[PDB]
Amino acid sequence: SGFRKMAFPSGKVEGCMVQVTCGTTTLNGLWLDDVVYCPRHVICTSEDMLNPNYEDLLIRKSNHNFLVQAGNVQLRVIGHSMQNCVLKLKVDTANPKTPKYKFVRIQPGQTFSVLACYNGSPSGVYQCAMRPNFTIKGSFLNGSCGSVGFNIDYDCVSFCYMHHMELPTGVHAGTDLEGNFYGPFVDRQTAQAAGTDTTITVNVLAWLYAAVINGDRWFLNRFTTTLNDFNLVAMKYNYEPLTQDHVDILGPLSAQTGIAVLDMCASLKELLQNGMNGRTILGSALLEDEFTPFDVVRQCSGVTF
Amino acid sequence: SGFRKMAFPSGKVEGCMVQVTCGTTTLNGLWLDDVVYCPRHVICTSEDMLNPNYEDLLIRKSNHNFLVQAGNVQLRVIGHSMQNCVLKLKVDTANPKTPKYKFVRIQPGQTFSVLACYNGSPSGVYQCAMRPNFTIKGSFLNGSCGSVGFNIDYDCVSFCYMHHMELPTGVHAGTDLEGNFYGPFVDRQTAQAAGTDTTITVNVLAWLYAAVINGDRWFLNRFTTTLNDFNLVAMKYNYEPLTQDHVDILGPLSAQTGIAVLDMCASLKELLQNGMNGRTILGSALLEDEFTPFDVVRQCSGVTF
Ligand SMILES: C=CCn1c(-c2cccc(Cl)c2)c(-n2nnc3ccccc32)c(=O)n(-c2cncc3ccccc23)c1=O
Ligand SMILES: C=CCn1c(-c2cccc(Cl)c2)c(-n2nnc3ccccc32)c(=O)n(-c2cncc3ccccc23)c1=O
């Protein structure tokens, strides 16, 4: 039945996006209840971004200096405060489109959908993973700051990411909705390096399981292995160490396919040592690591919202 | 700045999805104004699907045999008619969430977003192309019939696809919103073959342009070529013949990058003849053909809706 990088339906998040302007800097905000959340660097000019003192810069800013626009409607700002690297603008109107929602700080390797926005308007939606070095490989242009990443369970939106910046390498960094960056990055235009980008081994395994479910079976080999033997191979190829929590989380996929997790590890090992020989798996010519075990099950079982 | 398979924001389509039941068969419908559209095979049992006489089967069906459910609300069916392979159920209530919309029949090689639905509820969204053999490579499970593909321009939804079936090969077939299948397929459970799946050459070129825009430049070679010389190579590799309309449509990407279209063709030629040598382009280890020139420009310029 096929296998795609599938994002969550984005309508619940679309109705929360607004445009936030301060002076001559415009970006996106997220309007939930009577609070608008946005990157605190909305208060900065280009000259500020080289070395900003946010507390000093914010002192110069009153409620009426923040223009918040929801579609055509202008919201009245009655309060502002900085929480870590986000600003929270209190407005006089609760968003009537507020979904049920939560703020969550995800773990590296987990995935989420991004609704890329410009000027408070949605442009498109795609699925992403938090990399082990805490960057994301997104698609973001100037003006995209404030766009949000989320997951949806039934009717509840779990916001996990707010986009802040592009690194000089072209990968992306940002915060949770409490304003704490993922990773060591800071909201300053200085060179910052990400660290080694390793591969999310438990996600690769899940996708191999997905491939078996879908009939792509050529890579299944005759071998098995051990957790320590496999991790010797993982380390050599900059794969994340596989732990017993990871084996456990793969239990349902192992059960569905009748392939023991350590057998699948030995197939992955042989793929790492021998490459793919010009073949493909689920239409990809490399090992994909942006599907979690839950994504695989969710997609292969038709979970809805 | 990165490059992703990006779908359109799906909220406008979410509020049109409903569940349609007839006897013991349930699938999705699309509720626009006071009409619900769905695959006519909603009227079939398993035994029917082997060789259905739809006109005969429909005679047995009255307005009250179609149960249409919108969220929890039950819609009152006051009219039904078959148009090619879709049913149109007239209901007594206009959808209040009806967006501006159009029905369009797309050309092979064009792309669109799919909102995969089960029981009238959205599950996820992803981008797709109509393949040259008129199949799509989707992600669809039992119950997904009736899910729709669309494009969005500003505020207008252009519906282009309604999912009907999976072929024995695991690829997907369906109709436009007038009920006419893409391709030679019929809504019967008989073996049907798709034809040779060729590669959408103008889309590969666009994505190569995208790669240059994003800094991935290693594949640019010293050669140029001619349209006839290139097409000799395209035919050998099951690539669609490139025409002068295609060259024309690539004009803005050529202008942005300063790379003449025929020069990019010679780089593609060398990639087809030499492979990729274990390298990657925009994070892919094969040549991607599911981005149109408009998708590339749209993504690389931040068009919103
Ligand atoms: C609406 C957002 C504009 N904004 C800004 C920016 C924000 C406030 C004031 C100014 Cl003066 C600039 C970016 N900056 N600049 N230094 C930065 C240091 C720390 C954090 C962000 C930084 C920034 O990186 N981005 C981009 C994010 N993602 C992808 C991009 C692709 C191309 C260009 C910019 C991108 C912004 O969009
Ligand atoms: C809600 C849809 C159920 N429906 C049906 C179906 C529809 C009406 C009556 C019955 Cl009795 C079956 C499928 N059928 N069956 N013969 C078919 C011949 C022509 C057209 C469709 C056909 C069908 O292919 N699909 C699948 C579509 N896409 C992916 C699938 C993956 C797994 C299983 C089914 C899938 C349906 O979901």
Residue numbers in the entry:
A (entry chain A), B (entry chain A): 1 to 305
Publication passage describing the model:
Proteolytic processing of the SARS-CoV-2 polyprotein is essential for viral replication and depends on the action of nsp5 (1, 2), which encodes the main protease (MPro), also referred to as 3C-like protease (3CLPro). MPro is a clinically validated target for SARS-CoV-2, with the MPro inhibitors nirmatrelvir and ensitrelvir used clinically to treat COVID-19. Starting with a lead-like dihydrouracil chemotype identified in a large-library docking campaign, we improved MPro inhibition >1000-fold by engaging additional MPro subsites and using a latent electrophile to engage Cys145. Herein, we describe the discovery of uracil-based, nonpeptidic MPro inhibitors exemplified by the advanced lead molecule AVI-4516.
Last, we were able to obtain crystal structures of N1 propargyl analogs AVI-4516 and AVI-4692 bound to MPro. Although AVI-4516 was solved at 2.35 Å resolution, AVI-4692 was solved at 1.85 Å, allowing for a detailed analysis of the binding mode. Both compounds retained the same global binding mode of des-propargyl progenitor AVI-4303, with their isoquinoline moieties bound in S1 and benzotriazole substituents in S2. Of note is that C6-aryl analog AVI-4692 engages the S1′ subsite and forms an edge-face interaction with strictly conserved His41, the catalytic base in coronavirus MPro enzymes. The C6-chlorophenyl substituent of AVI-4692 contacts His41 of the catalytic dyad, which is absolutely conserved across all coronavirus MPro enzymes and may, in part, explain the enhanced spectrum of this chemotype. In these experiments, MPro activity was not regained after inhibition by AVI-4516, AVI-4773, AVI-4692, or AVI-4694, confirming that the modification is irreversible and the adduct is stable over the timescale examined. Although AVI-4516 and AVI-4773 maintained potency similar to nirmatrelvir in this triple mutant, AVI-4692 and AVI-4694 exhibited enhanced potency, likely due to a combination of better permeability and improved inhibitory properties. The C6-aryl analog AVI-4692, by contrast, was a somewhat more potent inhibitor of both CYP2C8 and CYP3A4 while AVI-4694 showed the overall poorest profile, inhibiting several CYP isoforms >50% at 10 μM.
